[PDB]
Amino acid sequence: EILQVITSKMPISSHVDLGLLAEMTVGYVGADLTALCREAAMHALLHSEKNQDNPVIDEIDFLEAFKNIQPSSFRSVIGLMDIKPVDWEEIGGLEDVKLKLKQSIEWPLKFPWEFVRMGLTQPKG
Amino acid sequence: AATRREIFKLQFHSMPVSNEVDLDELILQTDAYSGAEIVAVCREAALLALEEDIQANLIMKRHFTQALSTVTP
């Protein structure tokens, strides 16, 4: 939705992905996404035809303008929330360690009244 | 025997125990545990009664007999 605001002003044709343009652009900030959509307008005005009636910007020059834009620093640091969803069934075996991790961190953060009424302490790390 | 009555009587003030669980066969089935392992039986029986039917009310003998088998010495 950062990209869909900038795409709305420019006349870009309907044959352009967004999810692949979101996924390939990991490491950028909101200033570099404007300049990516600035540079893909330039190589579609730079190279062009003689008709000048259909502003066709396609996936050829978004991937061309991805090549010569360097990514911003000061991102890989501090702490990162949201990553990928991993289920419990991916970890094969370890049934007893899954039981001990559930009884000391998820039951004390999801059902807090039934933990304190039964008289059990929360382990503090 | 009578010291072990007072450790269960202090630990029954904080958790709901049924009126069917009787203290006389709990005193008989300890048979020289330590004073810290008698606290760990009451900790383990509460976690087994929450693992089955987490919206719970009370602890019965089937939680207590299974918790005595898990904590051994």
Swiss-Prot record, chain A:
Summary of the tissues where the protein is detected: Expressed in both neurons and glia during embryonic and adult stages of brain development.
Subcellular location, record wording: Cytoplasm; Cytoplasm, Cytoskeleton, Spindle; Nucleus
Domain of life of the source: Eukaryota
Effect of residue 91 to M: In DFNB119; no effect on interaction with AFG2A and CINP; reduces cell viability
Signal peptide interval: none
Ranges annotated as spanning the membrane: none
Assembly information from the UniProt record: Part of the 55LCC heterohexameric ATPase complex composed at least of AIRIM, AFG2A, AFG2B and CINP. Associates with pre-60S ribosomal particles.
Family: Belongs to the AAA ATPase family. AFG2 subfamily.
Function: ATP-dependent chaperone part of the 55LCC heterohexameric ATPase complex which is chromatin-associated and promotes replisome proteostasis to maintain replication fork progression and genome stability. Required for replication fork progression, sister chromatid cohesion, and chromosome stability. The ATPase activity is specifically enhanced by replication fork DNA and is coupled to cysteine protease-dependent cleavage of replisome substrates in response to replication fork damage.
Disease implicated: Deafness, autosomal recessive, 119: A form of non-syndromic deafness characterized by mild to profound sensorineural hearing loss. Sensorineural hearing loss results from damage to the neural receptors of the inner ear, the nerve pathways to the brain, or the area of the brain that receives sound information.
Descriptive protein name: ATPase family gene 2 protein homolog B
Organism: Homo sapiens
Name of the encoding gene: AFG2B
First and last residues shown, out of full length: 376 to 500 of 753
UniProtKB/Swiss-Prot annotation, chain B:
Crosslinked positions (Glycyl lysine isopeptide (Lys-Gly) (interchain with G-Cter in SUMO2)): 61
Localization annotation: Cytoplasm; Mitochondrion; Cytoplasm, Cytoskeleton, Spindle
Disease with which this protein is associated in UniProt: Neurodevelopmental disorder with hearing loss, seizures, and brain abnormalities: An autosomal recessive disorder characterized by intellectual disability, intractable epilepsy, microcephaly, abnormal muscle tone, and sensorineural hearing loss.
Free-text note regarding domains: The first ATP-binding region binds ATP with low affinity whereas the second ATP-binding region binds ATP with high affinity.
Subunit composition and interactions: Part of the 55LCC heterohexameric ATPase complex composed at least of AIRIM, AFG2A, AFG2B and CINP. Associates with pre-60S ribosomal particles.
Family: Belongs to the AAA ATPase family. AFG2 subfamily.
Function summary: ATP-dependent chaperone part of the 55LCC heterohexameric ATPase complex which is chromatin-associated and promotes replisome proteostasis to maintain replication fork progression and genome stability. Required for replication fork progression, sister chromatid cohesion, and chromosome stability. The ATPase activity is specifically enhanced by replication fork DNA and is coupled to cysteine protease-dependent cleavage of replisome substrates in response to replication fork damage.
Protein name: ATPase family gene 2 protein homolog A
Species per Swiss-Prot/TrEMBL record: Homo sapiens
Lineage: Eukaryota, Metazoa, Chordata, Craniata, Vertebrata
Gene: AFG2A
